[PDB]
């Protein structure tokens, strides 16, 4: 890779000046070893004080391996980097990926280190390995090549990648390959046995046409991804409390579905009755409940993905290891809902479960739409920002905001 | 001539679009002009500056200043303008080490590097921007024009470029001498080691040996300053550390700037003096910005100050860090949203102390504050020691498990153990998850007229108990809370309450144990006294009996 691609920031925007956050000694030592080798390989270089920019860095362990990986938080640089139309006006997101029976995710970020970064842009990739307790000046570097996690790296590399994939694509016309940041998503409908080998067939391709983590494979089955429609209880005896909760749920659902009615069911709650008193359903209330049940079977109307708007992901803690979430662009027009349980690690660690939920939801968002949602997280900012990097295992990072007032609607997805 | 390596130049630029400075040189007295010509002649002989021609269009004013018992004139180049137009730099000297993160060193030498400073050349392409002019006597000849060849004192980039140039020069020496530590800040180079003093004095020599290869002359820091080192407000002693003496001024009249300075000192002091409190004192400077405004001290601020004075009577000291021992952090609740903590490795030998104050807010509870304190100490400990300490917290393991499993947010506290030191943090009420059999059911509601501010609040129950209370100067939200309060007041130890108030649910589901709203506080006091409370929400105006009835009773 000889010629660099001219890269620039957006009009009237300077480079990132983001504070490095404190790192544990073990992550510093890991980054020191990593960056020493990258510097020997020419991928990064020491910079002097005339470079004022900075992007935070930390270290992670990808899912199911013991070697530290450097992770740069390029979120600020990414949003300040010019919008990219690599060689064409845009690679249409493949609507077919979300339908494949199996999708495997490959870390191909290491391929980026073979392309030089435009020399005029390098200063904007500055980062700091901090010392403990400010005992020594942080170690200052910038990238000489396409960095993992930067928006422009897949863009600039897209020409080189399409060529590597051509012979494989030419041979397997029904396999769907989609590239998002440092990752490749490879979906087939065939047996996992041949799927796997077929996956390895594609690794060798990148191995002959060229990795510390290329051996790994994150396996997904989006054809088995299950949604969460709105369900109403089926009971033989309703207490006053049961009906109160039902009318509340139906009233909330009426903002989503037209023609939900609660008149007949509210009729049952005539008088000032004890909450535990059993109320027989009339025939009018049962019909109304049946008509509501029917309405709720059908999907929401006029829900369409608008590629110009952000995706918003809300998450609720339901307790006992269970989490519900909804993805939408306008309120009450959910594009996707879901529910998780028994998060791999952390039967006793809420924040680790939430971090894993965020990663799984972001992965679903990439498959379905090719971009990451903005999260509304049920957690105090200070708790989240102290701990999430300890459980992070993806090479991208979405945006997030914090919910400080308890939503009343948690109980509706319950 | 022993060849010396050149110090690599740092390339420098002005901010984009901006040009160099063009500030007129003031008039100077004949005496000052003579003085400046002598100084600059010497500086030119030493290579620091050079005469330039008239084509250079830039200029920075120069001044002459006199001192008390140094009857010298001293030079002064006012680079204020040039700094405004100079690019930003990486300033590598933001934070300083905290003493509690340092390890003991048998021997410490301090070298002077103010002289090596001038060996750092200034980027050639940038020198033109540093031009200045000595006016001539009687303005009868052209002013003498000079520019800098070295980092000018007072120029924006000199600290960072100098610090960076030294670090680079030192890099190989530090890496090939893992048994010493080197710290630089300003014109001082601090070298420490656990070697015997003789064998340490030799490392020092080798360092001079190393430094000279860039032609850097560096002798001991003149009048080597007996322990402790007065550094960044600390007293670094060989075996202990503290803040420099903290003396709280005695006064009858306390003013805005006094209380600011008083909190400054107390905050500085709280990193080693345990149990410092600053809420009531900090309280008194809520919004005033006239530092001359006098403020009376609440009797709760005098008691707090007198409490601080007692803690300041005898000096306290911290110990240095031992990486082979555990790191432990212990927190106490002090009241009024205040928290204090100690970090130590052995009991009774604090590395440092600290405090935490609750965030501004209408409603809050002790467990949420304790969690915030834990996060603050975690992050401070990562900074200072590169690791999380083990926590000792005044909360029962069972309390915490009940809190986090039932709290609507994700929450986490790292490895910790209970320490039975009152007051203990506890949960003060827990709402039922299901309606209570045999408990009376209160349907509550309230409403207020937006124009007149007249309201009503009350309830109707399944046993026919009823109450409506007329209210003045109220609001919908207040009447909704008042209604729940009335139901709590008038019910037995177990009660089911039905409200349509999304506002009230939002407060109560946050599980406050204390509020700035007297009304919420009164509700909390009632919840504490109950044995069981189930709170149910229903949507307003849906014909939900009981709710409908009481909505009518209160909507006048
Ligand atoms: C060397 C140094 C000096 C100062 C000052 N002002 C500040 C910093 C941050 C320094 O930098 C480092 N200091 C240390 N530890 C400390 C431990 C405590 N003492 C005080 C002392 C010791 C011995 C004598 S004595 N008996 O020689 O008179 C007198 C005073 C100083 C060194 N560790 C590191 C690790 C990386 S940098 C660095
Ligand atoms: Mg009402
Ligand atoms: Na209390």
Author numbering:
A (entry chain B): 4 to 213, 225 to 428
B (entry chain A): -1 to 554
From the paper:
Compound K-5a2 features a thiophene[3,2-d]pyrimidine central ring, and replaces the cyanophenyl right wing of ETR with a more extended piperidine-linked benzenesulfonamide group, while keeping the 4-cyano-2,6-dimethylphenyl structure in the left wing of ETR. In the case of E138K RT, since the mutation does not disrupt the hydrophobic interactions between the inhibitors’ central thiophene ring and residue 138, 25a and K-5a2 maintain almost the same binding poses in the NNIBP and similar buried areas with each of the residues along the pocket as in their complexes with WT RT. There is no structure available for E138K RT and K101P RT in complex with either ETR or RPV; however, the structures of these two RT mutants in complex with K-5a2 and 25a provide a structural basis to understand why the mutations can render ETR and RPV less effective. Transplanting Lys138 from the structure of E138K RT/K-5a2 complex into this structure reveals a severe charge-charge repulsion between the amino group in ETR and the side chain of Lys138, which would destabilize the binding of the inhibitor.
HIV-1 reverse transcriptase (RT) (hereinafter referred to as RT) plays an essential role in the viral life cycle by reverse transcribing the single-stranded RNA genome to a double-stranded DNA copy.
